[PDB]
Design an enzyme around this catalytic site. Structure first.
Site, PDB file in Angstrom:
ATOM      1  N   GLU A 158       5.452  -8.634  -0.354  1.00 14.88           N
ATOM      2  CA  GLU A 158       4.031  -8.336  -0.191  1.00 14.88           C
ATOM      3  C   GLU A 158       3.285  -8.695  -1.480  1.00 14.88           C
ATOM      4  OE1 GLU A 158       2.710  -4.931   1.512  1.00 14.88           O
ATOM      5  OE2 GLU A 158       0.256  -5.377   0.918  1.00 14.88           O
ATOM      6  N   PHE A 179      -6.557   7.228   0.663  1.00 14.06           N
ATOM      7  CA  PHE A 179      -6.261   5.863   1.476  1.00 14.06           C
ATOM      8  C   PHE A 179      -4.509   6.009   1.656  1.00 14.06           C
ATOM      9  CE2 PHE A 179     -10.420   4.345   1.961  1.00 14.06           C
ATOM     10  CZ  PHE A 179     -10.359   3.696   3.253  1.00 14.06           C
ATOM     11  N   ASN A 189      -2.160   8.123   6.191  1.00 10.98           N
ATOM     12  CA  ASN A 189      -2.648   7.520   7.538  1.00 10.98           C
ATOM     13  C   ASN A 189      -1.864   7.830   8.769  1.00 10.98           C
ATOM     14  OD1 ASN A 189      -2.665   4.819   5.283  1.00 10.98           O
ATOM     15  ND2 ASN A 189      -4.525   5.825   5.552  1.00 10.98           N
ATOM     16  N   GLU A 218       0.034  -4.113  13.301  1.00  8.44           N
ATOM     17  CA  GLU A 218      -0.710  -2.868  13.021  1.00  8.44           C
ATOM     18  C   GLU A 218      -1.686  -2.535  13.961  1.00  8.44           C
ATOM     19  OE1 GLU A 218      -1.148  -2.953   8.525  1.00  8.44           O
ATOM     20  OE2 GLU A 218       0.866  -3.701   8.589  1.00  8.44           O
ATOM     21  N   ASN A 256      -7.370   3.924  -8.846  1.00  6.74           N
ATOM     22  CA  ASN A 256      -6.601   4.462  -7.818  1.00  6.74           C
ATOM     23  C   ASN A 256      -7.185   4.356  -6.366  1.00  6.74           C
ATOM     24  OD1 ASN A 256      -7.548   7.606  -7.155  1.00  6.74           O
ATOM     25  ND2 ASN A 256      -7.966   7.139  -9.127  1.00  6.74           N
ATOM     26  N   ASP A 295       0.824  -1.200  -0.099  1.00  2.83           N
ATOM     27  CA  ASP A 295       0.029   0.023  -0.105  1.00  2.83           C
ATOM     28  C   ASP A 295       0.896   1.335   0.191  1.00  2.83           C
ATOM     29  OD1 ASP A 295      -2.198   1.794   0.278  1.00  2.83           O
ATOM     30  OD2 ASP A 295      -2.887   1.015   2.404  1.00  2.83           O
ATOM     31  N   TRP A 316     -12.311   0.755   7.593  1.00  5.92           N
ATOM     32  CA  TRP A 316     -13.216   0.085   6.466  1.00  5.92           C
ATOM     33  C   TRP A 316     -14.064  -0.709   7.199  1.00  5.92           C
ATOM     34  CZ3 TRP A 316      -7.721  -0.391   7.395  1.00  5.92           C
ATOM     35  CH2 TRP A 316      -7.348  -1.480   8.138  1.00  5.92           C
ATOM     36  N   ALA A 324      -4.671   0.707  15.555  1.00  5.21           N
ATOM     37  CA  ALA A 324      -5.110   2.240  15.797  1.00  5.21           C
ATOM     38  C   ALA A 324      -4.906   2.891  14.495  1.00  5.21           C
ATOM     39  CB  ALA A 324      -4.453   2.760  16.903  1.00  5.21           C
ATOM     40  N   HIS A 354       7.491  -1.517   4.395  1.00  3.36           N
ATOM     41  CA  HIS A 354       7.376  -3.170   4.490  1.00  3.36           C
ATOM     42  C   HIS A 354       8.485  -3.673   3.582  1.00  3.36           C
ATOM     43  CE1 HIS A 354       3.552  -3.160   6.243  1.00  3.36           C
ATOM     44  NE2 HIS A 354       2.885  -2.535   5.313  1.00  3.36           N
ATOM     45  N   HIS A 387       6.925   4.192   6.776  1.00  3.80           N
ATOM     46  CA  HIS A 387       7.401   4.097   5.283  1.00  3.80           C
ATOM     47  C   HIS A 387       8.356   5.117   5.082  1.00  3.80           C
ATOM     48  CE1 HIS A 387       4.982   1.559   2.733  1.00  3.80           C
ATOM     49  NE2 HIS A 387       3.949   1.625   3.515  1.00  3.80           N
ATOM     50  N   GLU A 416       1.173  -9.455   4.437  1.00  5.07           N
ATOM     51  CA  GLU A 416      -0.076  -9.603   3.739  1.00  5.07           C
ATOM     52  C   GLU A 416       0.394 -10.281   2.316  1.00  5.07           C
ATOM     53  OE1 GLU A 416      -1.585  -5.311   3.202  1.00  5.07           O
ATOM     54  OE2 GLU A 416      -2.746  -5.955   4.911  1.00  5.07           O
ATOM     55  N   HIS A 466      -0.094  -8.933  -1.828  1.00  7.04           N
ATOM     56  CA  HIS A 466      -1.569  -8.647  -1.061  1.00  7.04           C
ATOM     57  C   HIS A 466      -2.441  -8.873  -2.328  1.00  7.04           C
ATOM     58  CE1 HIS A 466      -3.861  -6.194   2.044  1.00  7.04           C
ATOM     59  NE2 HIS A 466      -4.757  -7.196   1.566  1.00  7.04           N
TER      60      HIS A 466
HETATM   61 MG    MG Z   1      -1.382  -4.464   1.349  1.00  7.57          MG
HETATM   62 NA    NA Z   2      -2.799   3.109   3.385  1.00  8.42          NA
END
Ligand code: MG
Ligand code: NA
Ligand code: MG
Ligand code: MG
Ligand code: MG
Ligand code: NA
Ligand code: NA
Ligand code: NA
Ligand code: NA
Ligand code: NA
Lengths: 1015, 1015
Positions: free
Chosen positions: B408, B593, B596, B529, B589, B193, B991, B531, B383, B349, B453, B410
């Site tokens: 990853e 999101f 964060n 991960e 896209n 992500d 979500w 909160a 990640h 990140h 993920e 995902h």
């Molecule tokens: Mg992901």
């Molecule tokens: Na995100």
């Protein structure tokens, strides 16, 4: 591009465009053909006559060859190793790599095999679906072309490589071109103790699959606590386009009876946050009171997997044999179906003396029958995945299998230099994973193995956990790095001894009895390799089996090994002979270390084989009074094809005998009451022999097969009668150089300077070609030699101890030689001393007594120096003038036997042709001994006493100077060796002293007696 | 061959000619420079101006580029992402792959970056030694040429890729050519992500080493029972030609003092039957009473590794920082140096709003300072492996690190499709192994992670065991496949809740208190991960920390996440704005999101940061009479830089204050007596406030820094005095359309048709732009919206429940509106009903009492239909005429706080500029609320009561209609929202609904009262 990349010098590239591995496929388009395992029209063989050319390197290959047959090329059979056709030499090396150790590079002179084939492809195969080619075995790497276009590349000699040819073929004629490299980066992981060869040595075939197809399937069987209910679980995967109408049916058959069935749409259980496998399905079938699979009773069901439409229209079908069995370790014991196993195993390489490493059905079946006829129940695939037919045959005949990945790096320094290196993990993983993906449905496979002799590295740990994760049904073992690492479920040493510790640094081999009870240890112990059967070997074999029976957590092992790796060469007159390392110009080489078999290259038994059968018996015996107690070591079957034959004999002469049916439950007992025995007429020892006979033929044996036997001494009546004194009195004739004795038509001569019996006459004819002399040496066995060579001596081997101590060079010095006339006899007294560089090694004192009846009683007393290495033998030899047809003896027999390998032999009267008294081991040595003998007959000669002997046309000297059996020539007359005592042969290994203390001649003072007469 | 092979569409080829991975090297030639970590002459930077050209595919690249500079190419700065220079668009996607999922293939349109450089090499580097080139980061795959000739190829965007240039370099000018592909088979393993970019985004360097060299070293520290003794163990490996005179010395330093030393020749211990590593050595140094490393006190030593000769000649020197610490799991607890950790962590990140994914020292330091200042003690590398400089800073400033592999998947279906496939094992293993080989000597790295993920597949198991085999000093963790699989030493769920179960099939997120005690479970639990800090968020943060403290085995977690991934775009005037997903033409896209964080992209704090700081405090408090009891949560240090400020206030007014030193041991208590407070005269509530202050500056903070605080209510004296009896009386003015009330200059108007206060006058100026009306809605927060979009509605989200029920469209119907004249006041009484499609949602009943002193008392009673979705708020709004500079209140502050996010706020008297009452979230929503307020002052207005409020120039309507903060424009006057009750903001995730039951407005019947006056 292909010559530019050099993919065969890159361990990051192990294939190009190769398809995924899978269980055996046939793509049946009829369910009934699948059930009955009949041939499939969708699976064509491409074996037969191909075009072939040899090149010294891949740079020498002309570019025309991609599109035109070379006119210089020949026509050869495929499958084949090209060394077996003479195009270059096969090499035999044990540890040391056959190339310079420079990973990842190979020599620039890299022998190259260009194979080609022109063949038809039918139009029907091209209009619909997918056509693939399958190479089951290519050694060691290769590039493939079809109709002049490049297809892809493959490595690993021992697993199938498959490619899609759909886009490449045309209707009518097509041409394949395969470039096979002898050496590659794959070679660094293929350092097995065997002949190094190359080429396309397993099957090639062509398979047609639909567009929507079965791409993989797994079968599992799990049970309740008493095994009265099972659940069969089958996971199936597909390729092609996904549609709601698609279905799988798995059906289970026993003969022609369907016992269970399941049908379901695709789309597995939810697995994670993204869902499940829409291209997978799991079927679960309930089975009540299942017939279980074991090596004792190999019960099989047939599973058929059908991909079809809801409405019932077949797309294709695959199938396999299913054996319901559980394999688990609990409380430190390996269990099969809840019972503790006892592994009667052997190691088996894939080897044929004419065809090299190509395997065929006739040979494989021949091997399995011999194994089972000799009480083996398990086999190890040393040291690579086998020909796929092997597994099917083990499933059907009943053998436990250890399937082993194609990884050995024995020659690295230290042994784990690659297996600890993460950059060699990719190449290693492919060799383990592609094995599990291919063989995971065979019930005969009970254990996975990570390879052999590659020390212990982190890659072993990763790949261990990978297997346990994908297949919990089976334990994983690995011997490397000390045999008890975190990468093994089973303590699996090689050549660890029963009572004796060998405390090597870092990788000690403990006595197996001690190894079990080390602080914190709980695992079962099964030897991956033991009892090295090189030449005249297998001494001390009974000691293992006694320990196996007494200790629950000692569960057997696998003998090294099944069959001699010799090859056939031809001489000038066109006669075949057996050859070993070096015999092809191959250098460096490891000579005869490639011959370790229980059988010869052509499957004739070595004498050791019968010792394995007896010790690996399934019935145990005890005697009390008139009562035989029979115990069964079977875990599942009753003795439903067994009877007991018993016989009682007096010094070989039969007196009484009978039969009783055997009715024993697994682990049970049966008490057999012997009838009143008749009273013996005369002197002698009574012996009882029992043997278990199989009245009915089986899949693996003939009617009358003998599976077990045992002997006991009964009542002895010692001889108390004096042979009534004769009329005649022998006459002594003294000369300066000879003592001569005369009695009727018999004459004896004792030389007064040598001190020995030089000649003996019956009537007028000479009986001796050589004088009767003491002998303390033997033509050295492989076990006696070890790794000792002319150019590199190991002073610790028994042969070198003997050489350095002068045992072979020692000269008899005469101390005493007198003659005396007695009332009814003549008595000769002698004494000798064997010396070397002023040290006295041996002293032999004798008396010969010749009485009125022509008998000669010889009494011998030997002193051996405490500080000389213990002698190989204490006895006598001579070369007899007579050559007779038959040898007759009362002793242990009928086969070759030695003090530490004699339990299989039985006491009785035996009679064989002279040639049988010689074991033709390919590397020649002392052979043919028979022990515990009370009487020997040869021509008009008879010897009595308590001795061991061999008899043959070959002197110990010829036997020790000649290297190949075919180079032996028969000598005039017959060489006779009669020993009072003989040293064990050992063989717990063949590279260090292995003869156990209680079979060494260390008493210092020895005594034996012999009577020689005419009959 | 480069164009024909297509190595970027082949997961079996991940590199060509790449050198082995290793810890940071510098090849020092002087020991003192190695010890001091000063620059090396043997390590050159190639950062700066390079040549660059963009192409749409590798097929479009001219062959002349290999030989000569392209006249069209531009000069650009390296390191960089080529999207940041405008050559193509960056793409924001969360789960869904940015390319068609079709492994192993990528699109034929593959934006290709062509980089080149002209450089000189020092003369001596050509004569002897080895010159390599290092690329710390290239995204995502590349080919390399030097002087026109091909060198090699590289994948994995996040670990260094190194190549030997020795055979390639020449005197004078050299040219590098680097072809960088955006997409590769490597992209399939890189689905984090985040924004998807490409290029050479990390450092490029040259390293000159001797032919005889240090090629690897490992450092380990193990301890006795109570850490009073340590052994430091260092293994060292060499390359080149082995000589008997060579040696290794490892020396340990503390400042300028040598504490220990060890020297040995090469030749390690025996490892197996083939010996040991002749190219390796292991040194062991003793250390008594070692200074232990932790995040509380980051004690470091320096280790210098010298490859030298026996007579004291140095060849080369490497070095690293060493921290003495032990990490182990015992009895279900994660221990550091014998003590159980409490992880105050955050995900981070690598992101910069101008430079994309290029990191620099300044940004890194800034990040670390802000984390420590906010009571964070741990960071997670989400990640992928980070820029090498990050681990050096973490070692030195002190933070626990979770180092994560760059894997990853995902977007696969199911999530484990790749990670369970043995054919993806090689690509995966290089991502784990090469991370460990690089970072294993860093002390700040306490946990290894297998990625994120990617489901749970058998490749995870294999790599789990690999790490445990090569490095048993650190636990291994991984979240995929349910957070508690066999591939993790720690239960490490993402967004699992405190009390509430979420029983998703296969992968349930049990409540964390429950998860600990599931049958058979023994492991510690730390959320990887938790909160989710998206927009206005972090509601329920206190609930996590209360449980972390009560449960020994709940040992903390990592907040998602540190910083907003917004990018800078420029408009028509060249003014900057914060951009998110979609704003570059990027499609499909995932919009906002990518934002964060606890901090904006420029490292300005969100309001949520202060709530993290407070809940993560290291001092706990209890009050009992005059006694304050302080407890330390530190495990290792004393409060040697800490004093306690206390103060007591009556409704914001100071009465007494003091200072007391803090001297509390780790886990210790301290009792502090208050002096007896002087007696308060007037009515009010007394409040005690305590803060912990650090009087001295540190490496991470300034003097005066506040690290902890807490508040208590003391004595309350309830007001009983009658207000001063006023002598004026208010007058009623009726017409059919309006009730008007008058007193002096003051004037109120009530519209008899709408039923609301429509205008107020102070003299002759209008005070209102919009009438005073009930409001039951808010501009929806990100937590309100979830994954709901216009084209794909999520009916379960709070905003969709509100929209569907008619909350946003409800119109007020007037039921009752009356005026009464009392003795000294005027009473107005109203009733309204909000309806939608014939259904009544809310009923509001109000009274307005305007009295002789000019004050207006509003009483409100609301009914909410039990079957409507609970409303976001129960309050009033209006638009005030006046715009003023300051806002002054007595209540919780000073920052934005919400009912489920207000523990950090303190009750006192606050005064801020109007712009600080607005939080500029990039995606605009309801913001700036302040709770527990008893008095609001703005301009001439004053409101008293017990309410929640927010004040700004932007209406709730404009906030909900505008998608970006830069597109908002200030409205006339000031919008005021005053609530009696406001719903929680949530945030356990963004979500699904995440506001706890006790923070939803469900009572059905609500009451509140306000007084509005002009002070
Ligand atoms: Mg992901
Ligand atoms: Na995100
Ligand atoms: Mg290769
Ligand atoms: Mg070997
Ligand atoms: Mg690739
Ligand atoms: Na046993
Ligand atoms: Na051998
Ligand atoms: Na010989
Ligand atoms: Na805790
Ligand atoms: Na908005």
């Amino acid at each position: 591009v292909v010559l530019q990349r050099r993919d065969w010098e890159n361990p990051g590239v192990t294939q190009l465009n190769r398809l995924a591995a899978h269980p055996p496929f046939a793509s049946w388009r009829n369910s009934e053909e699948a059930r009955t395992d009949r041939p499939s029209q969708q699976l064509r063989s491409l074996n037969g006559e191909w075009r072939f050319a040899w090149f010294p390197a891949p740079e020498a290959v002309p570019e025309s060859w991609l599109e035109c047959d070379l006119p210089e090329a020949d026509t050869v059979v495929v499958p084949s190793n090209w060394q077996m056709h003479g195009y270059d030499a096969p090499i035999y090396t044990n540890v040391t790599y056959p190339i310079t150790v420079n990973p990842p590079f190979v020599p620039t002179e890299n022998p190259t095999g260009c194979y080609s084939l022109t063949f038809n492809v039918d139009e029907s195969w091209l209009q619909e679906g997918q056509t693939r080619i399958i190479f089951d075995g290519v050694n060691s790497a290769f590039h493939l072309w079809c109709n002049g276009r490049w297809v892809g590349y493959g490595q690993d000699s021992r697993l199938p490589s498959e490619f899609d040819l759909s886009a490449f073929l045309r209707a009518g004629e097509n041409r394949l071109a395969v470039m096979v490299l002898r050496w590659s980066d794959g070679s660094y992981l293929e350092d097995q103790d065997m002949w190094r060869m190359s080429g396309i040595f397993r099957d090639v075939s062509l398979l047609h699959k639909p567009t929507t197809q079965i791409s993989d399937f797994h079968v599992a069987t799990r049970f309740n606590d008493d095994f009265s209910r099972a659940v069969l679980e089958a996971e199936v995967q597909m390729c092609g386009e996904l549609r709601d109408y698609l279905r799988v049916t798995v059906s289970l058959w026993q003969g022609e009876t369907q016992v269970a069935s399941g049908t379901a749409p695709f789309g597995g259980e939810i697995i994670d946050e993204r869902g499940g496998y829409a291209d997978r399905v799991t079927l679960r079938l309930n089975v009540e009171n299942p017939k279980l699979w074991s090596a004792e009773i190999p019960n099989l069901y047939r599973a058929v997997v059908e991909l079809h439409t809801a409405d019932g229209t077949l797309i294709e079908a695959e199938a396999c044999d299913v054996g319901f069995r559980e394999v688990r370790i609990e409380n430190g014991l390996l269990l099969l179906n809840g019972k503790p196993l006892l592994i009667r195993g052997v190691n088996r390489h894939e080897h044929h003396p004419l065809h090299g490493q190509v395997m065929d059905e006739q040979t494989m079946v021949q091997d399995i029958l011999l194994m089972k006829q000799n009480n083996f129940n398990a086999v190890r695939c040393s040291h690579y995945p086998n020909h796929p037919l092997w597994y099917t045959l083990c499933d059907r005949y009943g053998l436990y299998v250890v399937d082993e990945a194609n990884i050995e790096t024995h020659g690295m320094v230290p042994m784990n230099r690659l297996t600890d290196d993460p950059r060699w993990l990719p190449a290693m993983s492919e060799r383990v994973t592609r094995m599990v993906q291919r063989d995971r449905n065979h019930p005969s496979v009970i254990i996975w193995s990570l390879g052999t002799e590659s020390g212990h590295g982190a890659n072993h740990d990763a790949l261990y956990r990978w297997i346990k994760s994908v297949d919990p049904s089976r334990p994983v073992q690995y011997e490397g790095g000390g045999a008890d690492t975190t990468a093994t479920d089973i303590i699996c040493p090689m050549y660890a001894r029963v009572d004796e510790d060998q405390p090597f640094p870092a990788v000690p081999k403990w006595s197996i009895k001690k190894w079990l009870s080390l602080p914190g240890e709980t695992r079962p112990l099964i030897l991956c390799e033991y009892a090295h059967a090189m030449g005249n070997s297998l001494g001390g074999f009974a000691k293992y089996w006694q320990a196996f029976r007494q200790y629950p957590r000692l569960q057997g092992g696998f003998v090294w090994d099944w069959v001699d790796q010799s090859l056939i060469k031809y001489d000038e007159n066109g006669n075949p002979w057996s050859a070993y390392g070096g015999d092809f110009g191959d250098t460096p080489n490891d000579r005869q270390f490639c011959m370790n078999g229980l059988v010869f290259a052509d499957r004739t038994p070595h004498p050791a084989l019968t010792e394995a059968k007896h010790q690996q018996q399934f019935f145990q015996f005890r005697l009390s009074g008139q009562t035989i107690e029979v115990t069964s070591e079977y875990l599942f079957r009753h003795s439903d094809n067994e009877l007991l034959h018993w016989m009682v004999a007096l010094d070989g002469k039969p007196l009484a005998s009978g039969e009783v049916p055997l009715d024993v439950a697994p682990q049970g007992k049966q008490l057999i009451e012997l009838p009143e025995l008749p009273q013996p007429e005369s002197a002698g020892q009574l012996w009882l022999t029992v043997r278990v006979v199989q009245p009915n033929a089986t899949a693996w044996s003939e009617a009358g097969h003998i599976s077990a036997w045992q002997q006991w001494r009964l009542a002895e009546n010692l001889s108390v009668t004096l042979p009534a004194a004769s009329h005649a009195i022998p006459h002594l004739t003294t000369s300066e150089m000879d003592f001569c004795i005369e009695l009727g038509n018999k004459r004896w001569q004792f030389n007064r300077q040598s001190g020995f019996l030089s000649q003996m006459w019956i009537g007028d004819k000479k009986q001796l070609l050589t004088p009767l002399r003491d002998q303390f040496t033997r033509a050295p066995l492989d076990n006696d030699i070890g790794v000792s060579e002319a150019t590199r001596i190991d002073p610790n081997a028994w042969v070198e101890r003997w050489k350095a101590a002068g045992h072979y060079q020692a000269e008899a010095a005469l101390l005493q030689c007198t003659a005396d006339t007695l009332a009814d006899a003549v008595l000769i007294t002698t004494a000798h001393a064997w010396q070397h560089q002023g040290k006295t090694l041996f002293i032999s004192r004798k008396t010969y007594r010749i009485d009125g009846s022509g008998q000669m009683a010889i009494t011998v007393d030997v002193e051996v120096a405490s500080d000389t290495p213990h002698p190989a033998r204490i006895g006598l030899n001579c070369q007899l003038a007579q050559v007779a047809e038959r040898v007759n003896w009362l002793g242990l027999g009928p086969q070759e036997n030695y003090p530490d390998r004699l339990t299989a032999a039985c006491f009785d009267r035996w009679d064989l042709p002279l040639s049988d008294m010689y074991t033709p081991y390919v590397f020649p040595s002392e052979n043919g001994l028979r022990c515990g003998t009370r009487e020997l007959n040869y021509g008009p000669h008879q010897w009595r006493g308590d001795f061991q002997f061999n008899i043959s046309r070959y002197s110990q000297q010829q036997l020790m100077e000649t290297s190949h059996r075919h180079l032996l020539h028969a000598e005039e007359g017959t060489w006779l060796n009669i020993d009072g005592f003989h040293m064990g042969i050992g063989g717990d290994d063949s590279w260090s002293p292995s003869v156990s203390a209680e079979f060494q001649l260390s008493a210092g003072r020895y005594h034996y007696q012999l009577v020689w007469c005419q009959k």
